[model samples]
Target: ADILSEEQIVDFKEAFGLFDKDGDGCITVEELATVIRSLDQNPTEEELQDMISEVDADGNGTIEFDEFLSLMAKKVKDT
Candidate 1:
């Protein structure tokens, strides 16, 4: 997954850590809701769950680094 350079990858990981509030190595729906709130959006429980489900490839009910990257990559490309 060398889509990004080493430095870029480090930055992305650090950014991810900030959103990973509990530091449990994965991003939970609650953690993601915090992110949405930071963006000044009021997130409903259903909306947060919907966001997570969109990128939750493994179906383990959480977002891992790959899933996170996939979502980010898609947004970056779309922009």
Candidate 2:
């Protein structure tokens, strides 16, 4: 919880919104794959599935803002 500052939280919200492509307040596998592809990295559907399943906490097949925040904070800590 302490890993991210308020400013960082705001920035993350913006990033999450970008990934939420359709503005549905959740990030779907397709949206994630699209972003990944735009970054020049091609990941297989299975790979994206694995990635989403990791932070998808509720097994709903989509990432809500809270999930994204948790994942990003962990990744930032690791880096």
Candidate 3:
């Protein structure tokens, strides 16, 4: 469901790069703690966890680039 076009690849890599701390090509809730700080807003861990759970389509608790593309696309669509 989440697909990235060649045109988007470069930009997506740039924006989500920081969260890929271990260079394993994925990001998780633990990795995303810094995301809140950078996003300029805060939510409790429980609340954040629930929100991330929704986006974690694979139920693996980590985000793939594919997952994130759909997330970003859905966000833009919703707004």
Candidate 4:
């Protein structure tokens, strides 16, 4: 059984919203960097690029809500 419940989905969305600085309904590398920084982690440019490549579905250099959710869902399933 998945540990991530529906409530978790909503929470994640809310958190994503807080981190999306551009107000473009998508999370970019810059926004992700902010998130990482908030967690006291400094992501190298290469790491950030790799994450963008993995999460961005439209190749637009940003990850939309759906794209982020999809990745999160897959991770939850894997765990």
Candidate 2 has a TM-score of 0.82
> Whose TM-score is greatest here?
2
- Give all candidates' CA lDDT scores: 0.77, 0.83, 0.73, 0.76
| Pairwise TM-score winner, candidates 2 and 3 | 2
Model 2 agreement with the true structure over 1-79: per-residue lDDT tens digits: 5564577778899999988889989878878888889989978988887887887788788888999998888678775
All candidates in order of TM-score, best leading? 2, 1, 3, 4
lDDT of 4 at 39: 88
lDDT of 3 by residue, 2-78 (tens): 36555566667756676676778888777776676678877877877787777887778777888777777778766
Clashes by residue pair, model 4: none
Q: 1 or 3: which has the higher TM-score?
A: 1
Off by over 4 Å in 3: 1-5
Worst 10 residues of 1 by lDDT: 1-10
lDDT of 1 by residue, 19-76 (tens): 8988899887777777778989967888767777777777777788788877787678
lDDT of 4 by residue, 1-79 (tens): 3464667767678867877866778777777888888889988979888777786667787777788777677677675
Evaluate model 3: give its TM-score. Answer: 0.74
Higher-ranked by TM-score: 1 or 4: 1
TM-score against truth, every candidate? 0.78, 0.82, 0.74, 0.73
Give each prediction's root-mean-square deviation over alpha carbons: 2.8, 3.0, 3.8, 3.9
Worst 10 residues of 3 by lDDT: 1-10
